[PDB]
Amino acid sequence: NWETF
Amino acid sequence: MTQRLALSDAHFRRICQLIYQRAGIVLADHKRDMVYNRLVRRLRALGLDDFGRYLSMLEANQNSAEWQAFINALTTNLTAFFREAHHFPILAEHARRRHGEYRVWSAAASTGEEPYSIAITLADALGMAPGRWKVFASDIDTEVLEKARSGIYRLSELKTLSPQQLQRYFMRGTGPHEGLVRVRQELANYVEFSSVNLLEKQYNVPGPFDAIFCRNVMIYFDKTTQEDILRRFVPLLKPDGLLFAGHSENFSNLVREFSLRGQTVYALS
Numbered sequence: 179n180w181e182t183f
Numbered sequence: 184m185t186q187r188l189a190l191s192d193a194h195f196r197r198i199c200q201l202i203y204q205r206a207g208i209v210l211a212d213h214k215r216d217m218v219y220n221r222l223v224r225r226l227r228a229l230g231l232d233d234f235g236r237y238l239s240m241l242e243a244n245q246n247s248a249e250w251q252a253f254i255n256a257l258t259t260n261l262t263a264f265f266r267e268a269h270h271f272p273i274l275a276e277h278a279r280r281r282h283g284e285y286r287v288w289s290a291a292a293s294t295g296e297e298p299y300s301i302a303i304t305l306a307d308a309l310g311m312a313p314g315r316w317k318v319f320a321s322d323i324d325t326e327v328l329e330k331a332r333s334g335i336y337r338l339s340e341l342k343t344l345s346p347q348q349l350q351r352y353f354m355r356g357t358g359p360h361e362g363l364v365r366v367r368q369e370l371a372n373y374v375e376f377s378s379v380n381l382l383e384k385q386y387n388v389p390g391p392f393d394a395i396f397c398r399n400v401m402i403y404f405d406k407t408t409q410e411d412i413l414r415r416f417v418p419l420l421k422p423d424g425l426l427f428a429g430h431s432e433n434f435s436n437l438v439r440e441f442s443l444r445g446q447t448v449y450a451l452s
């Protein structure tokens with residue numbers, strides 16, 4: 179998936 | 184007669200003519216290898232074994248879907264985030280001294296690196312609030328525009344972004360997506376992508392613009408085409424708007440009405 183830095 | 188898939192002088196010249204009248208791109212004899220390589224893939228995709236067959240189907244059907252694929256095949260889309268970096272600080276100081284919605288037009292957006300580099304500069308200098316700024320990006324290449332729309336890039340390609348820009352405007356892929364990044368929808372919301380052929384006698388764009396980025400694209404056009412587009416831009420620029428050219432371009436050359444105002448930056452009058 180995708181996430182914040 | 185031919186060879187196992189051979190490109191004849193005659194076909195190369197027809198291809199040169201066809202791409203020039205559809206996109207304005209001037210191809211040279213020293214590019215006949217790229218042409219062959221980029222185009223045999225289209226022949227294969229369609230199951231044709233002849234360039235003359237391919238060429239004729241195109242000519243006989245001007246509305247053929249293959250025309251867009253033919254154009255996409257011959258365009259050179261090399262671009263990069265924060266390319267010709269010195270332009271961005273200039274864009275920021277200019278936008279900061281102006282009022283009203285700051286509108287920019289990236290006339291040769293390619294895969295999106297340019298329009299997003301502009302959006303980041305402005306979000307950083309102006310903030311992200313409805314009606315503060317807007318970026319319009321276009322290209323004749325529908326493939327690259329699609330890539331731009333998705334806003335997915337390789338993390339290794341963002342060598343020029345500060346950690347604060349990453350943290351602020353991108354999402355990081357993990358697992359199957361590890362190594363990729365995606366521009367956040369919040370910043371993407373301020374960028375509009377459309378297809379616009381610079382050869383058009385009239386641009387279908389939402390101007391006037393405070394700035395127009397027309398970098399590394401004029402180099403593919405001939406003299407009169409370059410001057411015609413430059414003249415089409417004039418009435419599209421707001422009062423003290425800016426026109427940015429690539430490292431190789433000199434606009435004050437074809438039209439003196441444009442004055443150099445920094446590293447490949449021009450202003451009117």
Ligand SMILES: Nc1ncnc2c1ncn2[C@@H]1O[C@H](CSCC[C@H](N)C(=O)O)[C@@H](O)[C@H]1O
Binds near residue numbers: 322381
């Ligand atoms: N007639 C035309 N109208 C619009 N875009 C064109 C064009 N002919 C070529 N192009 C586009 O111009 C792009 C140039 S690549 C340069 C991208 C960016 N401006 C940069 O400075 O990094 C290519 O992606 C190609 O599709």
Ligand SMILES: [Co+2]
Binds near residue numbers: 179360
């Ligand atoms: Co996924």
